[PDB]
Amino acid sequence: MHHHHHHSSGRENLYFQGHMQKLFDTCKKVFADGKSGTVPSQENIEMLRAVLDEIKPEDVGVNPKMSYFRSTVTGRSPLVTYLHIYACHRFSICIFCLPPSGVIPLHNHPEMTVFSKLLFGTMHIKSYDWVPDSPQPSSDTRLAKVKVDSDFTAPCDTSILYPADGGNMHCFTAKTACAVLDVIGPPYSDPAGRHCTYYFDYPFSSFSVDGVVVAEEEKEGYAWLKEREEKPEDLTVTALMYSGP
Ligand SMILES: [Fe+3]
Ligand code: NI
């Protein structure tokens, strides 16, 4: 939903100070080692989480008065603006700017570890993980366990998702203007087989499949997720390079 944007990957010239400089230096260490998709060491995860947990929106130069947090479009949900900070083959750092009612629709992060901090605003998050080795009603629909279903109002601390835990499938819906700082390791890559897949979600009771038995009081904790094709409305838009007078 941003991996189509053209950016200078591995850019040589950067200008960061303070917390952003520390964040960048920490990411270079945290994500450097092992084959693609390697989850960083637990010590390095804790280090990066703590660096991110010191960061306030002012430290990364965003505030809710910026134009990125307002949309006038009608017929669809508000445009979400992508602010590129840095990317290379091992990780990306970026900020998503959601006007009220902006959405990043339900999607996965295959082989990816993602650190996320809500910088300001009230955001609803729904997230899931697959139930491994479970029956399916159809090839494109799979059983998932609900992990998060809550509003978050900043100030908030950093969360983490893993390739197969911590809510690898999630949907973000802004209730007020929101800014989210994400560190994504590694980024999506269609050439590398890390596609961004989107889903429609359904209550457990919407599909009755043989070989699946869930107790009554646990059913609300599960969902069926159906793969669906990316739509133009899913995609974030670029920020203006030059914003004028
Ligand atoms: Fe995501
Ligand atoms: Ni993308």
UniProtKB/Swiss-Prot annotation:
Enzyme class, broadest EC rank: oxidoreductase
Reactions it catalyzes: L-cysteine + O2 = 3-sulfino-L-alanine + H(+)
EC number: 1.13.11.20
GO biological process: cellular response to hypoxia; detection of hypoxia; peptidyl-cysteine oxidation; response to hypoxia
Binding site for Fe cation: H107, H109, H170
Cofactor mode of binding and number, as noted: Binds 1 Fe(2+) cation per subunit.
Keywords: Cytoplasm, Iron, Metal-binding, Nucleus, Oxidoreductase
Main location (coarse class): nucleus
GO cellular component, as recorded: cytosol; nucleus
pH relationship of activity: Optimum pH is 8.5 with CGGAIISDFIPPPR peptide as substrate.
Listed cofactors: Fe(2+)
Lineage top rank: taxon: Eukaryota
Reported induction: Up-regulated by hypoxia. Up-regulated by the ERF-VII transcription factor RAP2-12 during hypoxia.
GO MF annotations in UniProt: cysteine dioxygenase activity; iron ion binding
Annotated compartments: Nucleus; Cytoplasm
Role noted for this protein: Catalyzes the oxidation of N-terminal cysteine residues (N-Cys), thus preparing the protein for N-end rule pathway-mediated proteasomal degradation, upstream of the N-end rule enzymes ATE1, ATE2 and PRT6. Controls the preparation of the group VII ethylene response factor (ERF-VII) proteins for degradation via the 26S proteasome N-end rule pathway. Acts as an oxygen sensor that controls the stability of ERF-VII proteins, which are stabilized in flooding-induced hypoxia, and regulate transcriptional adaptation to these adverse conditions.
Family (UniProt): Belongs to the cysteine dioxygenase family.
The protein's name in its UniProt record: Plant cysteine oxidase 2
Source species taxonomy: Eukaryota, Viridiplantae, Streptophyta, Embryophyta, Tracheophyta
Name of the encoding gene: PCO2
